[PDB]
Design a protein around this ligand. Structure first.
Ligand code: CHL
Ligand code: CHL
Ligand code: CLA
Ligand code: CLA
Ligand code: CLA
Ligand code: CLA
Ligand code: CLA
Ligand SMILES: CC(/C=C/C=C(C)/C=C/[C@@]12O[C@]1(C)C[C@@H](O)CC2(C)C)=C\C=C\C=C(C)\C=C\C=C(C)\C=C\[C@@]12O[C@]1(C)C[C@@H](O)CC2(C)C
Ligand SMILES: CC(=C/C=C/C(C)=C/C=C/C=C(C)/C=C/C=C(\C)C=C=C1C(C)(C)C[C@H](O)C[C@@]1(C)O)/C=C/[C@@]12O[C@]1(C)C[C@@H](O)CC2(C)C
Ligand SMILES: CC1=C[C@H](O)CC(C)(C)[C@H]1/C=C/C(C)=C/C=C/C(C)=C/C=C/C=C(C)/C=C/C=C(C)/C=C/C1=C(C)C[C@H](O)CC1(C)C
Ligand SMILES: CCCCCCCS[C@@H]1O[C@H](CO)[C@@H](O)[C@H](O)[C@H]1O
Ligand SMILES: CCCCCCCS[C@@H]1O[C@H](CO)[C@@H](O)[C@H](O)[C@H]1O
Ligand SMILES: O=P(O)(O)OC[C@H](O)CO
Length: 156
């Protein structure tokens, strides 16, 4: 459908925004890449910024399935098509998007950032399969030497 696509788009976009930022922050602070994060979290303890966290891989997913499930449902429990995209309310404490004249601008920025992130995460992904290294690394690598770190060195 259509309206549904407007949801699909913004939703994936909001995830893609947190993800990308997330992938970079973890590599920049713990040295662990986003692709390995799963394995090292499973093999070594559950942790965040080095510190250890009790939860096992098991009680870990139970909590996820139950907690994201519950919320994904509550969200789906509303067909006011215009809130299925801009729920507002508790989701807008500061009330930045309260004023109707500002709304369109803010929504334009949000959709651009969201489309941008998705694109970038797509990159993040392909860049992992191809280089076996993290995004933050490829980036500081291409910067250290712009000419000899392109994707042409692969074929050449
Ligand atoms: C019951 C608890 C509940 C909680 C904890 C969450 C939590 C979350 N939701 Mg969900 N939701 C919840 C209820 C509902 N959601 C939605 C509709 C949405 C939408 C449409 C979206 C989310 C998204 C998200 C995330 C982003 C929050 C943010 O934007 O930062 C700013 C805000 C804060 C730091 C405060 C945290 C929120 C919390 C206290 C909300 C509790 C809601 C209620 C009081 C009930 C509804 C009445 C409201 C409108 C007054 C976050 C994981 C987004 C997502 O999935 O990202 C990809 C997204 O796009 N939720 C509806 C209405 C249809 C709900 C109804 O009960
Ligand atoms: C939502 C998106 C999501 C995505 C795109 C990935 C992507 C990835 N995970 Mg991952 N995960 C995701 C969510 C989660 N993961 C994990 C736990 C793990 C672990 C423990 C490991 C990965 C690994 C991997 C990688 C290899 C998959 C493969 O085919 O190699 C072949 C397969 C494997 C090596 C075994 C891993 C199976 C894996 C795909 C996990 C299944 C998780 C689920 C999506 C389901 C649970 C939650 C429900 C609520 C959605 C890849 C980078 C592995 C990695 O680090 O290697 C590079 C790894 O060791 N993930 C949890 C649990 C809390 C998740 C929750 O949603
Ligand atoms: C899709 C979103 C997403 C997802 C699924 C994950 C998933 C994961 N992350 Mg990532 N991460 C994200 C977003 C996400 N992250 C973002 C947006 C950031 C930036 C702050 C990070 C930063 C981050 C770090 C630094 C680390 C992880 C780690 C982890 C692992 C779990 C630990 C945990 O949940 O502790 C539960 C959560 C917490 C203890 C609370 C986090 C604090 C919140 C509330 C942040 C508020 C941010 C604020 C201070 C910054 C604003 C700046 C602005 C003014 C400029 C797991 C692989 C750890 C790992 O070892 O991975 C391998 C790890 O060390 N992530
Ligand atoms: C645990 C329970 C749970 C529950 C109750 C729901 C329920 C819902 N979600 Mg949610 N979601 C969850 C967890 C959950 N989600 C988690 C943990 C995430 C990851 C952050 C998401 C991310 C998410 C997104 C991004 C979207 C939804 C959407 C939806 C709705 C439709 C589901 C569907 O039919 O697609 C089932 C379909 C598939 C599994 C097909 C896969 C998609 C393909 C084309 C892409 C292949 C790419 C690849 C990178 C995927 C990852 C694989 C990986 C394991 C390696 C529904 C309200 C959709 C929505 O709101 O629609 C308008 C939507 O767009 N959810
Ligand atoms: C959308 C933003 C984006 C950005 C900022 C980057 C940035 C980078 N990529 Mg890349 N990448 C992207 C998307 C992106 N990628 C996507 C969607 C894919 C899949 C087709 C890939 C696949 C890819 C591979 C397989 C490799 C890189 C690599 C690199 C780095 C070096 C130069 C190179 O050869 O790129 C080649 C670029 C492409 C195939 C990208 C296609 C689309 C771009 C040109 C359009 C976006 C415009 C952009 C220039 C500016 C907007 C960004 C904004 C932040 C300013 C550099 C850090 C290399 C690396 O990691 O080495 C250090 C590498 O080997 N990229
Ligand atoms: C920069 C991209 C961006 C932008 C411009 C917007 C713009 C808009 N959004 Mg979002 N939104 C985004 C990303 C973005 N959003 C992401 C990633 C999520 C997922 C958390 C959402 C989820 C979301 C919901 C659910 C709602 C909105 C709403 C709104 C409106 C009001 C608030 C505002 O103006 O903030 C403008 C942006 C900024 C000032 C930048 C923020 C600086 C932050 C704190 C730094 C990074 C944080 C990080 C490290 C981790 C936090 C994660 C989390 C789980 C809380 C406006 C149309 C509300 C609406 O439509 O109400 C009327 C609403 O209810 N959006
Ligand atoms: C290279 C140049 C370039 C240029 C010029 C711009 C310019 C702009 N970008 Mg883009 N962008 C670029 C490249 C560029 N970008 C690239 C390559 C990317 C990477 C993919 C992006 C990604 C991007 C994102 C992700 C975002 C932008 C946004 C914006 C806008 C800034 C804020 C705004 O809209 O005003 C806001 C308005 C006001 C302060 C005033 C109110 C409105 C008035 C009435 C109209 C304005 C004109 C008026 C005064 C003049 C006519 C009067 C006449 C009757 C006499 C701006 C139009 C942002 C946006 O769209 O947010 C809104 C945003 O979030 N850009
Ligand atoms: C949601 C998304 C990514 C989400 C990622 C998440 C949650 C990641 C989570 C984690 O990583 C962290 C943070 C930390 C790690 O340690 C662990 C995990 C758990 C792995 C990507 C979407 C990515 C979405 C993409 C790339 C979408 C591309 C769409 C295209 C090209 C559309 C094209 C067209 O629509 C036009 C423009 C016009 C038309 O005429 C027709 C067509 C042709 C259809
Ligand atoms: C994707 C995501 C989702 C979080 C969801 C949460 C927190 C849901 C809570 C969801 C919470 C829910 C539903 C709570 C429900 C509580 C209720 C009913 C309890 C109660 C009651 C009442 C009211 C009856 C009243 C009675 O008098 C008392 C009592 C006590 O009995 C988080 C991602 C990240 O954390 C990572 C992974 C890594 C980080 O770096 C960054 C970010 C991005 C932040
Ligand atoms: C709602 C509300 C409410 C109330 O009222 C108020 C408030 C609080 C204000 C609000 C909130 C908000 C928020 C939270 C937000 C967030 C955001 C984000 C995160 C973004 C991102 C965003 C993001 C984005 C764009 C991104 C992008 C990305 C990209 C391009 C990338 C690229 C790349 C790649 C590929 C690769 C290589 O290697 C390198 C690089 C270069 C790295
Ligand atoms: C997909 C796994 C399901 C995760 C758990 C969702 C609990 S969902 C919860 O149930 C109440 C009573 O039945 C009603 C409301 C509903 O949102
Ligand atoms: C199917 C559409 C459910 S719609 C949902 O209903 C709630 C009240 O029960 C309202 O408070 C909320 O604003 C509205 O979007
Ligand atoms: O679409 P933006 O946000 O990249 O802006 C493009 C400029 O308007 C071109 O003049």
């Amino acid at each position: 459908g259509l309206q549904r696509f407007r949801e699909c788009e913004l939703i994936h976009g909001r995830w893609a925004m947190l993800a990308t930022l997330g992938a970079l922050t973890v590599e920049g602070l713990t040295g662990i890449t986003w692709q390995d994060a799963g394995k090292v979290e499973l093999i070594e303890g559950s942790s965040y910024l080095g510190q250890p966290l009790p939860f096992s891989m098991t009680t870990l997913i139970w909590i996820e399935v139950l907690v994201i499930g519950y919320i994904e449902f509550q969200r789906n429990a509303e067909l006011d098509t215009e809130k299925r995209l801009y729920p507002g309310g508790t989701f807008d404490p500061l009330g930045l998007a309260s004023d109707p004249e500002k709304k369109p601008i803010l929504q334009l920025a949000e959709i651009k950032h969201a489309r941008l992130a998705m694109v970038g995460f797509l990159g993040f992904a392909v860049q992992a399969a191809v280089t076996g290294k993290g995004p933050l690394n490829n980036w500081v690598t291409h910067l250290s030497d712009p000419l000899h770190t392109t994707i042409l060195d692969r074929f050449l």
